[PDB]
Swiss-Prot record:
GO terms for biological process: defense response to bacterium; killing of cells of another organism. NCBIfam families: lactGbeta_entB (NF038034). Bacteriocin activity requires interaction of alpha and beta peptides in a molar ratio of 7:1 or 8:1 respectively. Kills Lactococci. This is Bacteriocin lactococcin-G subunit beta. It comes from Lactococcus lactis subsp. lactis. Keywords: Antibiotic, Antimicrobial, Bacteriocin. Coiled coil: none annotated. It comes from the Bacteria. Pfam families: LcnG-beta.
Length: 35
């Protein structure tokens, strides 16, 4: 179950989904409303 090899499969892909569409958007803006 070597993960080190899996990360070398496509880190950019997951990196793109990690934020920059709604994840981080709804995270940083979530404070702007404070509600």
């Amino acid at each position: 179950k070597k993960w080190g090899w899996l990360a070398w499969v496509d880190p950019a892909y997951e990196f793109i989904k990690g934020f920059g569409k709604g994840a981080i958007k709804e995270g940083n803006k979530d404070k702007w409303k404070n509600i």
